[PDB]
Design a protein around this ligand. Structure first.
Ligand code: 2PG
Ligand code: MG
Ligand code: MG
Ligand code: MG
Ligand code: MG
Lengths: 432, 433
């Protein structure tokens, strides 16, 4: 059984408070921390913040910490449930909170415990975390994912005019995970120079996920820079491009604003059909293989129309919010063909594994993902391997809240030895 | 004794390879990783890189890793020494390398093992790492440091004209280390809004150590932004400013170039005296209480002259390179009055502890430091507590290679409970608390 659970406030990678949990058993100390998004979908489970405007500008998580220390911890300790009983412990927390969207304690309170339980369970099973997660998921094979590195940061938060949120490179042609890390780092550093040469040193600073933030508007120009960097690095045949549009961030009155970081003007708005047309031009003209959140989280018609008219991967993120109820709707409507898996969109390990299994049972891809606000935690590296999903996005190869996960993937690949497989060109459907 | 060692290449916070070491004993696996400078002084111990242009543009560390796996590991396993014997183990590595600047194995090979041994040592003692380090250093009475947060980045750490490398805020008036984190983070977020309002959103992306990289040239304007954010956040009485000029980065034909990232124009260069006059203006106009590397690493007369004419902290970094030989010279010449402590400038835990003790025995301060290429490793958080130095700089409160250290210092303060003491206004001299 659990001996002690103790939560505290730490700072995430943007310097804002988040929840960390230490959980002790007879095997020792197991620590986990909770990420935080910026372009957060409206259907995400509640992140509970303090709202004390005097303290961290309203962003403290003392309330969430206290729900853990004062309520969750003594309930789980008193139950006597072993930390191997992931589903019992997560369901107990869901029923203690009593709400559908985890608005009484916060999804941040519940998930920091859920993650720490999962780590403690692995140790009780005498397994590495990724193997424990595979057994929780009913997986046998393990597979290293292709990494998707966000190298030109844009969007709502980005320090530039670029509307679309992320321009990713995916080393599908690499020989192994460690090789994919080299391809991604070499293209990233090459891109820094392409940018410096074209825009000047001012353009070579980084945004929240470590990608460059150049002073550009046109989404085709981001794509051109990325393609130019892949070519100059010598990897044209081995690296392709993925996009996170995050279109909920620029939906306005039924249309979409591709210059929304400028001062409001409805004449510049385009329709979802216009937007779909732009994406078809990007797929023809650039090596784009995957587009995430091409339309707003509620614009079901545009998603299903677009998904039926293209062969690329279409990834639900704000549309699906790692939520089996929304995933069922997107399967019924054929809205997309891959789930972005963010444990803190739903708020427990058991529910995120259920979401992943639902997506895979219906033939979709699953890409595990960080949040833009991350920590030194590396849980998601073990999670992507244990779920055998074949694809992860967890930052540029820059800023160690991103590298901590990529370096852990390299350790997992080393540990698997001859048994290590790399998803490579089968990143969408690794089960083959 | 050590059961097994296994080193590998990981990526640092800039996406460049660096050394990580796993060391195994009866108590389990202990892991450490090595940081890497950009503005590196000419006298630092050798960072061994592979030079294979086909692989990470020559920046691989496979040679350092193989020296660990194939030569240093059986040497230390054969010794049979317990991992608690830091000094015997580090001396075994220094003798086996047998060079002054660690150019046979690389300082990055020797340090990676040195740090892993220290972590394994603490577990064998059943002590937290900061307690084991205090024992290594002969300290009994631990203190949490004031953090020095580099919230505007310039020089070799950022895409801007700004020549001076670091503009830091120190919450000397905080109540505790947790409170100093809240003050630092609130000023940093406030500063984002100050810069955005003045320079636009394009000025609020960050440099290598998580400070904002605004498109400005004047160092006085960086100080003005920082002081404005301090005031707007409401902490004028509790937060003061430190600088790392890193002047070796812009020393050019005997002069100093404050626009060194713009195409070469020697007509703009200023003299050592002119640069010293500018610092006097900063110290009078702004609450600057510490200046690091004000002159080039070999411009000894300018350092001595400036130090004698101010009453603030003057920190050697490239001047001293965590190196007892250079620190003795700096004491003899009164070049500075505080040591920047970087484990990888010298290459072993034992030597860094000796450098720290030598500075403190001479009445200097010691400020423990990260490198601008960091990892998710948190050793230096326990090191600054164990060494009782009173001051650490390890980034803006932004990028988790920075926050991992700050978060660990919060955990250490919580663990110490009612025994915790925060250095506050005694950051230069905490032994008095
Ligand atoms: O000069 C310095 O003090 C350091 C740390 O901030 O930078 P670098 O590691 O690049 O030398
Ligand atoms: Mg989002
Ligand atoms: Mg998204
Ligand atoms: Mg330097
Ligand atoms: Mg310095």
């Amino acid at each position: 059984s659990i001996e002690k659970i103790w939560a505290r406030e730490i700072l995430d990678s943007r310097g804002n408070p988040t929840v960390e949990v230490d959980l002790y058993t007879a095997k020792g100390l197991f620590r986990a921390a909770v990420p935080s998004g910026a372009s957060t979908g409206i259907y995400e489970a509640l992140e509970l913040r303090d709202g004390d405007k005097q303290r961290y500008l309203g962003k403290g998580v003392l309330k969430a910490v206290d729900h853990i220390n004062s309520t969750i911890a003594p309930a789980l300790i008193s139950s006597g449930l072993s930390v191997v009983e992931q589903e019992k412990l997560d369901n107990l927390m869901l029923e203690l909170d009593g709400t559908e969207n985890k608005s009484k304690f916060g999804a941040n309170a519940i998930l920091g415990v859920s993650l720490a339980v999962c780590k403690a369970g692995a140790a009780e099973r005498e397994l590495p975390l990724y193997r424990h997660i595979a057994q929780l998921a009913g997986n046998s094979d393990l597979i290293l994912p292709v990494p998707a590195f966000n190298v030109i940061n844009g969007g709502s938060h980005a320090g530039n005019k670029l509307a679309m949120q992320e321009f990713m490179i995916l080393p599908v042609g690499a020989e192994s995970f460690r090789d994919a890390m080299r391809l991604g780092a070499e293209v990233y550093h090459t891109l820094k120079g392409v940018i410096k040469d074209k825009y000047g040193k001012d353009a070579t600073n980084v945004g929240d996920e470590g990608g460059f933030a150049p002073n550009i508007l046109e989404n085709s120009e981001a794509l051109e820079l990325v393609k130019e960097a892949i070519d100059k690095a010598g990897y044209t045949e081995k690296i392709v491009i993925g996009m996170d549009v995050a279109a909920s961030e620029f939906y306005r009155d039924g249309k979409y604003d591709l210059d929304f970081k400028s001062p409001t003007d409805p004449s510049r708005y385009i329709t979802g059909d216009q937007l779909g047309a732009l994406y078809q031009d990007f797929v023809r003209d650039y090596p784009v293989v995957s587009i995430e959140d091409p339309f707003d989280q509620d614009d079901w018609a545009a998603w299903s129309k677009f998904t039926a008219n293209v062969g690329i991967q279409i990834v639900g993120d704000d549309l699906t919010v790692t939520n089996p109820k929304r995933i069922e709707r997107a399967v019924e409507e054929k809205a997309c063909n891959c789930l972005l898996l963010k444990v803190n969109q739903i708020g427990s390990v058991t529910e995120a594994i259920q979401a992943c299994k639902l997506a895979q049972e219906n033939g979709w891809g699953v890409m595990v993902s960080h949040r833009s606000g991350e920590t030194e935690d590396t849980f998601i590296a073990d999670l992507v391997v244990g779920l055998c999903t074949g694809q992860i996005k967890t930052g540029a190869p820059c800023r160690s809240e991103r590298l901590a996960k990529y370096n852990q993937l390299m350790r997992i690949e080393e540990e698997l030895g001859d048994e290590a497989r790399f998803a490579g060109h089968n990143f969408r459907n690794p089960s083959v």
